[PDB]
Amino acid sequence: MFKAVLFDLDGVITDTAEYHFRAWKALAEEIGINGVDRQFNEQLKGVSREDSLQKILDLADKKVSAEEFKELAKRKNDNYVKMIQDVSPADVYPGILQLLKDLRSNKIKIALASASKNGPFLLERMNLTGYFDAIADPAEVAASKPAPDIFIAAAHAVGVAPSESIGLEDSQAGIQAIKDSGALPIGVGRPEDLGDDIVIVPDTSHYTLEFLKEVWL
Ligand SMILES: O=P(O)(O)[C@H](F)[C@@H]1O[C@H](CO)[C@@H](O)[C@H](O)[C@H]1O
Numbered sequence: 001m002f003k004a005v006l007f008d009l010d011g012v013i014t015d016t017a018e019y020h021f022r023a024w025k026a027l028a029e030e031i032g033i034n035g036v037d038r039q040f041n042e043q044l045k046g047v048s049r050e051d052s053l054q055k056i057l058d059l060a061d062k063k064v065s066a067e068e069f070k071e072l073a074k075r076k077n078d079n080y081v082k083m084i085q086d087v088s089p090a091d092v093y094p095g096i097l098q099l100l101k102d103l104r105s106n107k108i109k110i111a112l113a114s115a116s117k118n119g120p121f122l123l124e125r126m127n128l129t130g131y132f133d134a135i136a137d138p139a140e141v142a143a144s145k146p147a148p149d150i151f152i153a154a155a156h157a158v159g160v161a162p163s164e165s166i167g168l169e170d171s172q173a174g175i176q177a178i179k180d181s182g183a184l185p186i187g188v189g190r191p192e193d194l195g196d197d198i199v200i201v202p203d204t205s206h207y208t209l210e211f212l213k214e215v216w217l
């Protein structure tokens with residue numbers, strides 16, 4: 001039986017992928033780049049803050065100074081951080097709180113495998129910190145999604161092999177990261193975005209321990 005579940009945060013635990021989208025779109029438009037729509041944003045889900053900004057700059061073949069690049073990433077983050085201040089336990093996605101409870105009762109480890117420096121703040125806002133056996137610090141890994149490092153690090157933090165872990169993700173980059181870690185991915189979203197080659201569910205209510213067992217079998 002799998003011995004750990006490795007959670008992405010944004011778009012898996014709560015609807016903060018939507019806020020990341022709105023914040024990046026606002027930033028892009030401030031600098032005259034208009035191609036950040038929902039379709040393009042699929043390339044920004046799961047991607048580090050700096051890689052995300054660079055994808056936006058590249059989309060328009062735009063070059064900025066190092067000083068401007070730093071200011072832009074900070075600006076988007078500051079807006080995003082304002083956006084999430086009222087996140088509460090009511091914003092936890094359906095199924096997630098119960099999954100966390102059921103996993104603990106069955107002695108299955110729980111780790112966060114998020115790119116986000118805002119991860120600890122968000123888990124606190126949602127009263128979820130106490131469910132997590134570990135939070136992998138995204139600043140510690142040498143490479144971010146789609147590299148597998150963050151999922152490998154989450155599994156290590158809870159003493160479980162990636163091959164005996166399930167990873168939960170809403171993003172193209174994150175699914176690739178889970179695959180290359182050795183963990184089993186279960187995506188949440190549209191197979192049109194996430195592929196027809198892995199198990200995908202339409203919403204997080206489907207993330208039950210029963211179903212995770214169904215899939216693992
Ligand atoms: O919250 P941040 O900026 O530290 C983190 F890098 C964010 O991670 C998301 C995925 O969990 C992204 O999709 C997002 O672009 C990003 O800024």
Ligand code: ALF
Nearest residue numbers: 009010046114115
């Ligand atoms: F949506 Al994440 F790390 F929280 F890619």
Ligand SMILES: [Mg+2]
Nearest residue numbers: 008010011170
């Ligand atoms: Mg995500």
